[PDB]
Amino acid sequence: TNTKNVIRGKYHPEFLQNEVLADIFAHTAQTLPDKTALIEADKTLSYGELYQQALIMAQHLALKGVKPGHIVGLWLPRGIELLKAQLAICLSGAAWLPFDMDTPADRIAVCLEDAEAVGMITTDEWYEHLAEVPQTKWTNTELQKPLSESVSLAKTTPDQPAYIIYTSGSTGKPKGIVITQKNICHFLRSENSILGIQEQDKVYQGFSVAFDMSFEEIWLSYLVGATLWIAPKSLVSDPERLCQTLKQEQITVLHAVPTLLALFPEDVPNLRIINLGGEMCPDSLVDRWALPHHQMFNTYGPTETTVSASLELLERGKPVTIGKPLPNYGMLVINSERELLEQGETGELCIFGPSVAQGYLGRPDLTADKFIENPWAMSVEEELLYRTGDLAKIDEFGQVHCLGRA
Ligand SMILES: NCCC[C@H](N)C(=O)O
C-alpha cells in the first residue's frame, strides 16, 4: 500500500492513443480546412492550405530519401515558412532538429553530425551562411516546387522520434534529447486537458522553435485548431510594444516566461489563458496578474520529459509552487543509492510516465545514468524514472517542493 511519497497526476489512459504527430495535425486540417492556422503580419494561411503545402514539401523530402526515423535539421527565420517546414518534416514521418535563429553555423554542423541527420531545411538567403556544413541542405523554395507525380509517404510509428532537442546556446559536448511521437502526443493531450486551449482561441507565437514552450504555443494550437499569431523578430524584444500588440490583435492565449510578463506596462484584459514557464512565478507578479478574468498558470518540467511535467493554477495570495504532475505524469524522490525516500525527506526529484524521453541520442552512458528503472512502477508506462538532478521534498500536503540542485 502507501501513497504519500509517490505523487501521480490524474488518471487518464485515454490520453494514450495509437497516434503520431502527423495524425493530430491531419485530423485538424481535415476537420477545419478553411480555418486560419497561421497569421504573419498581413499574411494568413488556413489549415487546409497549410496542410497541402506542407504535404508537397514532405513529398519532395521523400523523393530526396527521408523516411520515418530520419532526423532533419530546421533553420529558418521566425514566420510562416518556418512552421511550414517544421510541419513538412513531420508529415514525411521524420523528426526535426530545431535550430534557433541565432545558432552559429559550427554549432549546426556539430549537432547535425551528432544526430546523424540526413539533412536540413533552410531559406535561400541563409543557405550561404552554411558553407561549413557538410550535410545536405535543402531550401524551402526548392521543396515547394510543383510535383510531377504523387509521392506516397510512409507513416512513422509512436516508438519513432518526433524531434531531437540540442539545448540552444550550449557550447559543451552536444547532448541530443530524443522525444518520441508517443511522448509528445501524450503530452499535448495531457497538458491541454488542464490548459483548455480551444479552436476559437488566438494564441501568440513568440518562442523560437528551439525551445520547449514553442510546442505549447504551436502544437497545442494544432491540437484544437486555434489560430497562431507569429511574432516578428523585432517585436520579441520590445515588451511595451508587445503588450500593445497583444491587445490590438485580440490574443487570448499567452505562453511566456515571467520576466517578460513583468515588463508589460498595463493589463491585457482580453487574455483568456496565460501560461508561464521556465522560472517559478514571483509572488508580486501573481498579485498583479492573477486577476479574475485571467486564467494564470505556471508550468514546470525538464526537456527530458516532454515540454512540461507539472502545472499549477496560481492564485492571488497563494504561495507559488510547481503544482501537481500533469495527467499520467508522476513524481517521486530518491537518494544517492536510488532508494525511495519517505514523505518529507529530501532527495533527488524523479519523473515517470509515458512522456519520459527515450534518452540522449547516441550516449548510452549518460542515458543509462539518468534514465533508471522504476522499482515502483504500478504500470508499464511508469517503468522509467528520469533523474532531474533537482533536490526536492514532498510536504505534508502531498505537494512537491524544489530546493535547488543536487
Ligand atoms: N512549460 C515549460 C516548462 C519549462 C521548460 N520545459 C524549460 O525547459 O524551460
Numbering used by the authors: 6 to 411
Q: Can you list sentences taken from the study reporting this PDB entry?
A:
Here, we report a δ-poly-L-ornithine synthetase from Acinetobacter baumannii, which we name PosA. Structures of the isolated adenylation domain from PosA are presented with several diamino acids and biochemical assays identify important substrate binding residues.
To better understand the substrate binding in PosA, we solved four structures of the isolated adenylation domain. Substrates bind at the center of the core adenylation domain where residues mainly from subdomain I mediate binding. The polar side chains of Thr304 and Ser313 were also found to be placed at hydrogen bonding distances of 2.9 and 2.6 Å from the terminal amine group of L-ornithine. The structures with substrates revealed Asp217, Met218, Glu221, Thr304, and Ser313 as interacting residues with the diamine substrates. Mutation of individual residues showed Asp217 and Glu221 were the most important residues for substrate activation since no enzymatic activity was observed in these mutants even at high protein or substrate concentration. The enzyme assay with L-ornithine showed the highest activity while low activity was observed with DAB.
